[PDB]
């Protein structure tokens, strides 16, 4: 249902990016937002091939 070929590989990219983001904001004891922002910029620069 969620995580909205050319859609499949960007779904996988978003999947392991958000798993990594989950690791960050879980094990950091009091999390920040800046790494989420740079992950967002990474995945948008990745999908900007289209």
């Amino acid at each position: 249902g969620a995580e909205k070929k050319n859609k499949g590989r960007i779904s996988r990219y978003l999947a392991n990016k958000c798993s990594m983001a989950s690791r960050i904001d879980n094990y950091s004891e009091e999390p920040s937002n800046v790494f989420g922002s740079v992950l967002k910029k990474q995945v948008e620069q990745r999908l900007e091939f289209y």
Partner: protein
């Protein structure tokens, strides 16, 4: 007079004696070189091999074929070697000729010795221009090596390594000859004759990837493999070797310091050059620079962390917390500092001097002592912002007065892997320093 007798001895009899004679340590001012950078946009240049024609090659009949101009050859990581004129000192190295390699140089047998296709598959690593100036050999991760003509750069012949994993990692010419010692990463060293276009002998006995090689006039080879902390010196005409190991442990270095300060163990030997036929210098993975002889196993003189230590990461990209105290503590002090492990090193043959390069932005020049058991700084060459793949020195002038041109190929990643730690503004190009007297 006596000075002309001395100059006639120092013509060639000193170099056939094979000891360090060409002393210009204190004679060489450093701190006012003409330190010109040249940008070349071809995607991580990985080698420099200059070629100067030697006059009157041990008899007469000045040189070999223009008449008397120098050269340099260089190698990209996107499969392009380029031939530069360098002969006009205090001028930029001018690009002359070009040769690329595409996907069409992949053969169709693909599963045997035959890599007869003339160009390159991928990832050309390093060159060596022959001292008679007819050919330049090239070789990279595509398990070939090519003889290019030195004029039209036409594939004279292709020499396959005949191996599943024989990536050629460094080539070296025995000086004033055309025997070629290639250092193939299936733990072996190959020998080729260029004029016969063939393979004389393959010589085994190393222990990991033989990633750097050096040679001089007589039939020596000094190679280092990486993850075995050793250095093999091959003497061919009796077919034997000599294994010089490291052996500097940090607890014993703490014993040597504790009379009255951080240092760490040795990852890997990386680079070699040999200053004569009786001493050679290596550069390791902990920044250590070793000066070594024929007769001993331990280092004679090992300079410590040479190009300094890499800067620690910031607060902002170590943990992703919000509080600066916890992101300070996540740095763990100085404990995860790792050195500038050096990436290229070159000694002018039979000279008082050598040079070392990594991605500290700056070449470091060093002078051996007179008693040949120590060495020290001479200066600093800061225009080479980036990783130094290979340094080669070319010379001019009189019998006593010298005019040097240092040529250091600069890329923005290491010539084997990728392995950056935020390299800050590295132009792919050539550092070129005119330094005189």
């Amino acid at each position: 007079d006596k000075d002309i007798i001395a100059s006639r001895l120092k013509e060639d009899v000193a170099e056939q004696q094979g000891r360090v004679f060409r002393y210009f340590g204190d004679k060489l001012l450093i701190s006012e070189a003409k330190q010109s950078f040249t940008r070349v946009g071809e995607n991580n240049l990985t080698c420099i091999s200059c070629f100067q024609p030697v006059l009157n090659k041990y008899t007469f009949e000045e040189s070999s074929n223009n008449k008397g101009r120098l050269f340099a050859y260089t190698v990209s990581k996107d499969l392009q070697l380029t031939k530069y004129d360098i002969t006009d000192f205090s001028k930029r190295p001018k690009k002359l000729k070009y040769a690329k390699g595409g996907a069409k140089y992949i053969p169709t047998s693909k599963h045997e010795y035959e890599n007869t296709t003339e160009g390159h598959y991928d990832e050309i690593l390093t060159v060596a221009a022959s001292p008679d100036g007819k050919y330049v050999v090239t070789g990279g991760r595509d398990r070939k090596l090519i003889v290019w003509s030195t004029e039209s750069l036409s594939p004279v012949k292709v020499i396959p390594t005949k191996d599943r994993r024989g990536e050629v990692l460094s080539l070296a010419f025995r000086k004033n000859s055309d025997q070629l010692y290639a250092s193939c990463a299936d733990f072996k060293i190959r020998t080729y004759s260029i004029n016969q276009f063939s393979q004389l002998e393959i010589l085994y006995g190393h222990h990991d990837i033989v990633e750097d090689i050096s040679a001089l006039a007589m039939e020596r080879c000094v190679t280092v493999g990486a993850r075995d902390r050793t250095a093999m010196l091959w003497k061919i005409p009796d077919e034997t070797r000599l294994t010089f190991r490291g052996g500097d442990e940090p607890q014993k270095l703490l014993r040597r310091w504790m009379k009255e300060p951080l240092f760490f163990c040795e990852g890997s030997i990386d680079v070699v050059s040999m200053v004569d036929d009786f001493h050679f210098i290596t550069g390791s993975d902990n920044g250590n620079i070793c000066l070594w002889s024929l007769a001993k196993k331990k280092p004679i003189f090992t300079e410590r962390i040479a190009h300094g230590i890499l800067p620690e990461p910031s607060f902002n990209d170590i943990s992703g917390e919000t509080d600066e105290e916890l992101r300070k503590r996540q740095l763990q002090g100085k404990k995860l500092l790792q050195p500038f492990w050096i990436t290229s090193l070159y000694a002018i043959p039979y000279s008082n001097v050598f040079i070392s390069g990594s991605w500290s932005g700056s070449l470091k020049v060093w002078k051996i002592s007179d008693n040949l058991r120590s060495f020290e700084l001479l200066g600093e060459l800061s225009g080479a912002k980036g990783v130094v793949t290979k340094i080669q020195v070319v010379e001019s002038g009189k019998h006593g007065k010298e005019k040097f041109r240092i040529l250091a190929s600069i890329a923005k990643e290491h010539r084997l892997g990728r392995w950056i730690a935020n390299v800050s503004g590295a132009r792919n190009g050539i550092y070129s320093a005119v330094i005189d007297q």
